[PDB]
Amino acid sequence: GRLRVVVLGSTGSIGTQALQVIADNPDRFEVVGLAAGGAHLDTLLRQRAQTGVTNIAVADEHAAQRVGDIPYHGSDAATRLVEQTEADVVLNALVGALGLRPTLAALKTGARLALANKESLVAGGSLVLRAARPGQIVPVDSEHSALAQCLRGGTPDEVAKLVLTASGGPFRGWSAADLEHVTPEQAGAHPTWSMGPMNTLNSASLVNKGLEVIETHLLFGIPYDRIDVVVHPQSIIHSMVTFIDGSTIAQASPPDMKLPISLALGWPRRVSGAAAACDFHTASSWEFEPLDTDVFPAVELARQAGVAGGCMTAVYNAANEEAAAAFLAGRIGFPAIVGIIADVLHAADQWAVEPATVDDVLDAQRWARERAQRAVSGM
Amino acid sequence: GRLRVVVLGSTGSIGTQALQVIADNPDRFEVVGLAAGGAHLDTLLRQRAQTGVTNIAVADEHAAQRVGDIPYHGSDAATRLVEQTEADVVLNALVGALGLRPTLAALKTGARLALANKESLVAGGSLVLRAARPGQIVPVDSEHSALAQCLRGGTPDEVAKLVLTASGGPFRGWSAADLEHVTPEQAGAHPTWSMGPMNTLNSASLVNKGLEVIETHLLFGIPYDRIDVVVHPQSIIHSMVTFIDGSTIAQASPPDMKLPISLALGWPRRVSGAAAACDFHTASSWEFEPLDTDVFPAVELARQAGVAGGCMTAVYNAANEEAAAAFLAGRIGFPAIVGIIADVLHAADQWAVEPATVDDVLDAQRWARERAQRAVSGM
Ligand SMILES: NC(=O)C1=CN([C@@H]2O[C@H](COP(=O)(O)OP(=O)(O)OC[C@H]3O[C@@H](n4cnc5c(N)ncnc54)[C@H](OP(=O)(O)O)[C@@H]3O)[C@@H](O)[C@H]2O)C=CC1
Ligand SMILES: NC(=O)C1=CN([C@@H]2O[C@H](COP(=O)(O)OP(=O)(O)OC[C@H]3O[C@@H](n4cnc5c(N)ncnc54)[C@H](OP(=O)(O)O)[C@@H]3O)[C@@H](O)[C@H]2O)C=CC1
Ligand SMILES: O=CN(O)CCCP(=O)(O)O
Numbered sequence: 001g002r003l004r005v006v007v008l009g010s011t012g013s014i015g016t017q018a019l020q021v022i023a024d025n026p027d028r029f030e031v032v033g034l035a036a037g038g039a040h041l042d043t044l045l046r047q048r049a050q051t052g053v054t055n056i057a058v059a060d061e062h063a064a065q066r067v068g069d070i071p072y073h074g075s076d077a078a079t080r081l082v083e084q085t086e087a088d089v090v091l092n093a094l095v096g097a098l099g100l101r102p103t104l105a106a107l108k109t110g111a112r113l114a115l116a117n118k119e120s121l122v123a124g125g126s127l128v129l130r131a132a133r134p135g136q137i138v139p140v141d142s143e144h145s146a147l148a149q150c151l152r153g154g155t156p157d158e159v160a161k162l163v164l165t166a167s168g169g170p171f172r173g174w175s176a177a178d179l180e181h182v183t184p185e186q187a188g189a190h191p192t193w194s195m196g197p198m199n200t201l202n203s204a205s206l207v208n209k210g211l212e213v214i215e216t217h218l219l220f221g222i223p224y225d226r227i228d229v230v231v232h233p234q235s236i237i238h239s240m241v242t243f244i245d246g247s248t249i250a251q252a253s254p255p256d257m258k259l260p261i262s263l264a265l266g267w268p269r270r271v272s273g274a275a276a277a278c279d280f281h282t283a284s285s286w287e288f289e290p291l292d293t294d295v296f297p298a299v300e301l302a303r304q305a306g307v308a309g310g311c312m313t314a315v316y317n318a319a320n321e322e323a324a325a326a327f328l329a330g331r332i333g334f335p336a337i338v339g340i341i342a343d344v345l346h347a348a349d350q351w352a353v354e355p356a357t358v359d360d361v362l363d364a365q366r367w368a369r370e371r372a373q374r375a376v377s378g379m
Numbered sequence: 380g381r382l383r384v385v386v387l388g389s390t391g392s393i394g395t396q397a398l399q400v401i402a403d404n405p406d407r408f409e410v411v412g413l414a415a416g417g418a419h420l421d422t423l424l425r426q427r428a429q430t431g432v433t434n435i436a437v438a439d440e441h442a443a444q445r446v447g448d449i450p451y452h453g454s455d456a457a458t459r460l461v462e463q464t465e466a467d468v469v470l471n472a473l474v475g476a477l478g479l480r481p482t483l484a485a486l487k488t489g490a491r492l493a494l495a496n497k498e499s500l501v502a503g504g505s506l507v508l509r510a511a512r513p514g515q516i517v518p519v520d521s522e523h524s525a526l527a528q529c530l531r532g533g534t535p536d537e538v539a540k541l542v543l544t545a546s547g548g549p550f551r552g553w554s555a556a557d558l559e560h561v562t563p564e565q566a567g568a569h570p571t572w573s574m575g576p577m578n579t580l581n582s583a584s585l586v587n588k589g590l591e592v593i594e595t596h597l598l599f600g601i602p603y604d605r606i607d608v609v610v611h612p613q614s615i616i617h618s619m620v621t622f623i624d625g626s627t628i629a630q631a632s633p634p635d636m637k638l639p640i641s642l643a644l645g646w647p648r649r650v651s652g653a654a655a656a657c658d659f660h661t662a663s664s665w666e667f668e669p670l671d672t673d674v675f676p677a678v679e680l681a682r683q684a685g686v687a688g689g690c691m692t693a694v695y696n697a698a699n700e701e702a703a704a705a706f707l708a709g710r711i712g713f714p715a716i717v718g719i720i721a722d723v724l725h726a727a728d729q730w731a732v733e734p735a736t737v738d739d740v741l742d743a744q745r746w747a748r749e750r751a752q753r754a755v756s757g758m
Contacts, residue, residue, distance in 0.1 A: 246654035
């Protein structure tokens with residue numbers, strides 16, 4: 001049948017790619033709701049005009065002032081749209097901790113949640129896990145999509161290890177000394193039209209991978225000491241599962257987020273023609289190498305935060321957003337990003353308590369930002 | 380819940396590894412029968428003592444006499460052992476088309492046929508398929524084990540291509556001129572697997588991969604034009620499935636037959652500790668290259684034979700067996716193996732008819748052997 005899809009964060013990278021998948025597959029999907037922040041209001045309005053979807057939300061009231069016919073506007077507009085729209089699938093492609101309430105609202109409706117928003121799991125943690133029922137959350141991230149597919153190769157009891165792949169970033173194989181003179185521009189900070197500056201940076205520092213490791217644990221229920229990371233520079237293998245007999249199952253495709261997006265939308269049904277397959281007509285190789293955890297401890301710190309539990313992973317992530325932005329502003333060096341994350345985490349044991357509300361999560365993040373700010377400033 | 384296993388070809392490469400898996404897993408498996416040719420009585424008597432199984436078949440009459448009190452002896456011994464032994468699993472690890480009657484007898488008992496002896500399925504074709512219920516034949520070779528595991532990654536309608544990997548043999552990358560000089564000693568070594576003499580030779584000539592393409596079509600029902608072959612020198616990836624959305628799912632492990640053996644014996648349940656997993660704490664690469672079909676046409680010839688159908692795959696295999704014997708005896712050169720296969724197949728018009736009985740298959744093989752000898756006589 002046809003799936004009714006609410007797209008939250010419709011004007012972003014994931015949201016617009018999802019809309020292309022949906023436009024290409026009118027037999028499988030219909031859009032029944034769109035939500036955006038308001039900074040790309042003009043795009044949202046064009047999306048209404050193109051799709052005919054009038055069921056739209058804009059977070060920014062100023063932005064909403066410019067139109068006069070937005071059904072949902074202002075604070076919690078996305079949450080209100082979710083609560084009042086009948087849908088089969090909610091795609092949460094919101095950015096930041098503001099994706100958390102809409103995730104909670106979506107889960108309550110009993111719709112499938114195609115989840116891109118990282119903070120929903122990294123920060124929301126047990127709050128989101130307790131609200132979700134088995135199979136309700138389908139991950140959009142290419143690594144987690146890869147794992148979901150590879151886990152089909154046996155029962156849950158047959159899993160030995162989850163193995164995530166990492167590109168290694170621009171500083172792959174760089175020594176600690178090399179890393180000292182890393183500049184913002186080198187860390188991939190360009191004024192790129194779609195990609196945020198934090199995405200290349202988080203990939204470069206291996207924090208993105210630390211975040212994906214935390215989400216892997218929460219999504220798939222595998223202990224942190226059984227979640228490995230291997231460096232794979234080609235980014236063709238998106239992740240692997242190693243089973244108790246010694247068999248490894250791997251997912252492979254040329255990079256293209258439309259593959260994992262399409263499958264998260266249509267889960268468990270694959271979407272024909274979503275992306276190009278690996279081609280074996282020309283000679284190639286898939287390389288693997290270990291990560292030097294002494295030079296790149298971001299993944300180890302993510303495991304420490306995840307093992308501690310509660311709001312510790314919210315602290316990990318909020319510490320990074322602060323430390324990473326400080327690096328981008330010249331206020332710290334590159335190696336100091338993960339150094340600050342570790343310093344903030346070491347002081348954060350009060351946040352190991354489980355969050356009862358969204359407000360507990362925000363408080364932890366608030367504390368973590370302030371703590372990182374003091375570490376950056378010297379105060 | 381212990382599975383009773385009859386092991387045919389117990390003294391060989393697969394047979395001994397299978398006994399090792401069973402010895403390591405008395406919880407899951409018991410040996411209840413052993414069959415061998417009689418050329419290695421040392422090993423067989425050792426196996427009798429260690430397993431405590433006296434229910435034994437020896438093909439060679441003189442060899443069985445030397446031992447004394449062997450219950451089944453002569454060329455029908457393995458077949459009669461199967462017909463008269465109660466078991467849950469028959470592991471057919473015999474070599475050559477001589478495994479046909481034990482394969483048919485095994486299937487007739489209703490036991491699972493764990494098939495190492497792909498030649499009997501290649502030879503039997505639809506005759507063997509009509510004898511089996513769905514899922515009764517469970518492949519032991521790494522390729523089809525990999526395919527079966529990877530096919531769990533989607534539903535049947537989602538399968539676009541099956542991708543078999545080939546090591547390429549010791550002569551991977553060699554020219555046709557280079558191949559002229561190949562000796563049985565050179566062809567008797569394999570870069571990645573340790574196997575019996577016939578599979579070692581067939582891997583050097585690429586006839587093994589040709590036989591596996593036919594096996595894939597017969598076991599999985601996939602058309603010949605959707606079965607790809609790619610050369611992978613490391614033999615770590617054992618085969619892959621490409622799905623309609625562009626996703627590829629692959630199975631990988633250090634070459635060790637104990638892995639696919641364990642899974643075939645216990646299907647669908649994986650056997651804990653069977654084999655070592657891929658190790659990602661040290662650098663490695665998985666390489667792919669196309670097969671040079673001009674230098675190695677054995678897979679294309681297998682395709683032509685498979686497409687023709689009926690008794691034509693029995694002809695392909697039987698031609699190979701004769702040519703291979705002539706190469707190993709010093710009568711013909713290495714390139715003449717696939718040359719003779721081509722010459723015999725292209726004279727084999729009458730053999731596209733579907734076998735109604737075993738005798739149809741026997742007739743096709745008899746014709747093919749005679750025709751192969753004529754080709755040998757001509758050089
Ligand atoms: N991009 C990728 O390739 C990948 C992304 N992810 C994760 O998926 C999530 C989204 O990715 P991405 O599409 O790149 O993010 P983007 O920045 O590209 O798009 C974010 C979307 O959120 C909207 N938004 C911001 N604030 C609000 C609000 N208060 N209410 C409603 N909507 C709002 C924005 O609207 P507006 O534009 O008008 O401000 C925009 O449409 C992130 O958490 C990211 O970590 C995971 C794997 C890879
Ligand atoms: N070896 C491997 O790693 C792999 C094997 N295969 C397949 O498995 C099958 C066997 O492999 P492999 O172990 O190497 O073969 P082997 O040469 O190592 O052993 C063959 C076995 O069959 C027995 N045998 C030979 N002739 C007769 C006969 N006339 N009657 C009854 N039994 C007989 C032999 O007993 P004896 O010699 O003591 O008289 C021996 O135990 C092949 O079809 C091959 O294609 C598939 C994938 C990989
Ligand atoms: O399981 C192991 N094999 O089937 C051996 C494959 C050898 P080849 O790829 O060279 O045919």
